[PDB]
């Protein structure tokens, strides 16, 4: 049977400069639209009607301050389809109402699905194990938990992260002040995985590069390697002795070493995603009840935990009126928490 | 401070007093450790994907490698054949030596920049200040995300060390 | 009537050390939140 | 400090139950030939 399906399969899987595949039918339009939406929005589109902010090169923002901002809080969790009941097919209103944000996030979500299907598809054709796709589940868990689950637990898309550099910085600081997110052990595990992954990256790279076999005569050692050679290019035995004597322990199994390098950052990102799922519901690690009981009753008891809550309280009161304009917070000067003199 | 919550206190007051998030050297540092973690999982998954079958399914594939063996344990040509097609051929490494040099260089250079961020903000050369940078035709301030960050920073500033300042400027 | 599917199980010494380290460190991390 | 007193047994079983699992598996590996 060589019907149209098999002929199409032939064409999709041609060995070209940019492999396409069946996954490419999903991947390429959704990736291209998410990227083109971000560039279109950061270049031309405002956030005046949703946030009270300028947010495009057209308005005078720079690369750090442009964003595609979230819709107004009054949109709730609306899909904000261009043909939906809010924009009613009006492209200009759609842009003013935040339609590009769901456009980017939804095409981005399906683009990410398409990329992971691409990793599976290519792996099956070439004949390798699909561990690169499996490792990519971690960026997907992060994207889905932060840009979709989190706002879905909150009041509206407005509280999702906006797609911009400084907008993301505001998201970091909002999470400190409102959620006390540094205190959260799921974030802590994520930090460990990211910093430990960066550590493993540096140390494995440096160790290989400094246990190389002399396989050529030049002072540039890069040339003395051939992709099809059968031998290891660096000494596992010397590397093992170095770290055993410097650090106490060392790797001795090269397969375990590289599985571990997959394991550490992937698990870290997955742990951080779980914590953000909790924050969708405000299920925070905000307090230690034992500390609060002591501190309420004993005005001489002070820790770095109590010092940090005072900072969170400053963040909330001083940023909320501007950051949540739909709430209409009017905080007179006299109610604002402030230390002496400042 | 030498403690977990003390570290967070340090980070928060740092942001209030230097706007480190808006400093390109902290941004290069973030690229260093985000990238380092990405390339870590990348290198780990590609080598693990191309391990040469030396074991049965009831045993750990790790027993397929023996400490000190002369021959490589995975097929870098197959790994490069997968990753070259994932992106395009010339975005993929086939020289294990320069690949590992890249894994060394990227996080190390990034963390150097992070270190130099803290060291130069020690002398108060702070992150970019775009507070009230966008102004309308009449002269009204048009807020950007930078001004929202500033609001958060002010809250951190006015509350930190709440009994320690007698004069209006926190100059150190 | 012996079942042919049985298989011995292994845990080597390095895996014991790694596992004990994970559990102890996880306990050191979560204990504060358990006492609250 | 007014800590939650279940915290003690929660931490103790958290360490003990999985640690004991690993020790059982390890020791019966050594005793094999």
């Amino acid at each position: 049977e060589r019907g149209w399906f098999d002929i199409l399969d032939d064409w999709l899987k041609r060995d070209r400069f940019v492999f396409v595949g069946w996954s490419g039918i999903l991947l390429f339009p959704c990736a291209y639209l998410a990227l083109g939406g971000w560039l279109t929005g950061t270049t031309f589109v405002t956030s005046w009607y949703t946030h009270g902010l300028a947010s495009s090169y057209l308005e005078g923002c720079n690369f750090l301050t442009v964003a595609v901002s979230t819709p107004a809080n009054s949109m709730g969790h609306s899909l904000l389809l261009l043909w939906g009941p809010e924009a009613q097919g009006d492209f200009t209103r759609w842009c003013q109402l935040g339609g590009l944000w769901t456009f980017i996030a939804l095409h981005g979500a399906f683009g990410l699905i398409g990329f992971m299907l691409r990793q599976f598809e290519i792996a099956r054709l070439v004949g390798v194990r699909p561990y690169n796709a499996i490792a990519f589940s971690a960026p997907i868990a992060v994207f889905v938990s932060v840009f979709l689950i989190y706002p879905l637990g909150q009041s509206s898309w407005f509280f999702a992260p906006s797609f911009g550099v400084a907008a993301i910085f505001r998201f970091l600081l909002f999470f400190q002040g409102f959620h006390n997110w540094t205190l959260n052990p799921f974030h802590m595990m994520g930090v460990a995985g990211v910093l430990g992954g960066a550590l493993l990256c540096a140390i494995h790279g440096a160790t290989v590069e400094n246990t190389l076999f002399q396989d050529g005569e030049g002072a540039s050692t890069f040339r003395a390697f051939n992709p099809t050679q059968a031998e290891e290019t660096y000494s596992m035995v010397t590397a093992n002795r170095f770290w055993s004597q410097i650090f106490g322990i060392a790797f001795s199994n090269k397969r375990w070493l590289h599985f571990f390098m997959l394991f550490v950052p992937v698990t870290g990102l997955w742990m951080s995603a779980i914590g953000v799922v909790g924050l969708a519901l405000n299920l925070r690690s905000y307090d230690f009840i034992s500390q609060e009981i002591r501190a309420a009753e004993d005005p001489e008891f002070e820790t770095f935990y109590t010092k940090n809550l005072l900072l969170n309280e400053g963040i909330r009161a001083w940023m909320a009126p501007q950051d949540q304009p739909h709430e209409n917070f009017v905080f007179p000067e006299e109610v604002l928490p402030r230390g002496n003199a400042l | 401070p030498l403690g977990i919550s003390g570290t967070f206190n340090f980070m928060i007051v740092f942001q209030a007093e230097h706007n480190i998030l808006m400093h390109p050297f902290h941004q290069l540092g973030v690229a260093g450790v985000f990238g380092g973690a990405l390339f870590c999982a990348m290198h780990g998954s590609l080598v693990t994907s191309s391990l040469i079958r030396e074991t049965t399914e009831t045993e750990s594939a790790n027993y397929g490698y023996k400490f000190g063996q002369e021959e490589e344990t995975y097929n870098i040509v197959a790994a490069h054949g997968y990753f070259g097609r994932l992106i395009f051929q010339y975005a993929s490494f086939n020289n294990s030596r320069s690949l590992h040099f890249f894994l060394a260089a990227w996080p190390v250079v990034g963390v150097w920049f992070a270190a130099l961020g803290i060291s130069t903000m020690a002398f108060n050369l702070n992150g970019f200040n775009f507070n009230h940078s966008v102004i309308d035709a009449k002269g009204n301030v048009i807020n950007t995300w930078a001004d929202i960050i500033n609001r958060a920073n002010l809250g951190m500033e006015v509350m930190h060390e709440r009994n320690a300042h007698n004069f209006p400027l926190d100059l150190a | 009537e012996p079942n042919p599917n049985r298989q011995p199980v292994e845990l080597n010494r390095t895996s014991l050390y790694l596992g004990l380290l994970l559990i102890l460190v996880l306990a050191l991390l979560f204990s504060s939140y358990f006492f609250n | 400090m007014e800590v939650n007193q279940l915290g003690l047994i929660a931490t103790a079983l958290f360490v003990l139950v999985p640690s004991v699992f690993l020790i059982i598996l390890y020791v019966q590996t050594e005793s094999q030939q």
Partner: peptide, 30 residues
């Protein structure tokens, strides 16, 4: 109670370090 718990867990980890370094499986070349 909680102080004892924290210090006990910490002390076990330092003991674990000692065995993992000095009573490891020796790497053997082949």
């Amino acid at each position: 109670m909680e102080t004892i718990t924290y210090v006990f867990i910490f002390a076990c980890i330092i003991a674990l370090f000692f065995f993992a370094i000095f009573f490891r499986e020796p790497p053997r070349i082949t």
